[PDB]
Amino acid sequence: GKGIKKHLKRVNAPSHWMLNKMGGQYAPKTSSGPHKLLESIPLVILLRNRLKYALTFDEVKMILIQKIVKVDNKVRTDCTFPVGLMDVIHITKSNEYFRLLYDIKGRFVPHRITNEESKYKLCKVKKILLRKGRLSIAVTHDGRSIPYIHPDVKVNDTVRLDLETGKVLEHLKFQVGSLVMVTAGHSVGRVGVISSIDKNMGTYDIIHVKDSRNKVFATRLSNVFVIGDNTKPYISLPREKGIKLDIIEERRNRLKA
Template identity: 60%
Template sequence: MARGPKKHLKRVAAPKHWMLDKLTGVFAPRPSTGPHKLRECLPLIIFLRNRLKYALTGDEVKKICMQRFIKIDGKVRTDITYPAGFMDVISIEKTGEHFRLIYDVKGRFTVHRITAEEAKYKLCKVKKILIGTKGIPHLVTHDARTIRYPDPLIKVNDTVRIDLETGKITDFIKFDTGNLCMVTGGANLGRIGVITNRERHPGSFDVVHVKDSTGNSFATRLSNIFVIGKVRSGFVLVAVDRRVESEFGAMMITYGFDL
């Protein structure tokens, strides 16, 4: 007889991108239920202990979190197994540090430091648009946010920029050919490129063709594409706003885009 959700996760069954060694123990921290899936998230304990090295043990991570030093997307989180995911902003007030979770070229979450100004917003992919009770339009994002009364021009697969303090949409980027995107799933996880074509397959998965900075083309499912900016006449306008360039600038130079 089942007694609620599972509480354990064997270390060998944990996602590979957590980069846990096999010999340190039998178990891995099982992420709590939250806005990101188990295999697409990074628990807070792994970020603080294994990535930042701010703690040596799980107990030390618990002491840090229970002092309410850690914020994710502007909200204090005391759960050490809270599932942080793609584009989440992790803030440590005590040290004045801010991080955004994004993928590296090998599809692993990287420690990407950002400024306090950049930590005020995040980008979210629109997963669903629906009409709720009393005819109120709703929009659901990839991190399980529900936003009422969105701009009628925003459609599924577009990317919205959200002010973390108010939770309101301040800008959006359309899912169009010629725009810059990052792959968030599949064999090409972590790659950045320009959308060149979209193949529609009714009843199956739509396929998107992407061209990266070296001129190599690859294809992936539409559900794996996350639009992060606009490309016009060779210049990259990341996330509509020039201020975001400092955040993605190093990454774009790595991929060879001209800023």
């Protein structure tokens, strides 16, 4: 036969899900949708392992049968739906609102935003297409098509999107002084600004970022997400504000009882 695989084994699941190596040979195996498997979590993980509202898988099912969970203002009943980075989650029965973010480690957390902040999100552009009749469509990291994009929006910058109507509110550029969150290896939740851009011709582009403690790190261009202009961020942040300390200082701080 040799077709598409349908099962996922536990020790082969992405490590940032933090699954018990005992109790089971399998993992939920997220469905196909707006996010990649390795850059997302299935809804069962969020709703049982993190929030602890459910005890088993079937309890997640009984929760989702009654239409009380919404992602991006739409109800979802799929137990393996992918959730992903900047999405908002609303639970009517508890009247709660969350936004997923990376912490200073490489793992996802629900951030518990307020009701007013629950009406938008930030999307970063991946490419811009020109189609019949000369209209321009932007494709976001969210796997989303936005027609009639403003002519000044380019490939790597981010945009702010209303959720009741799929319209654009404003857009944020990708420059030397913009504020950034990094989303891949060796620095997955750090927030810094930007120092320089390299532009190697045939290969990857490297950019450098400076912390608010004057610490500097670098990464690839493809795992850089703009979250604000020079001064302030446009969303609330988790408690560390993306400041990563080394292990000696972290151990010293933790030793306060």
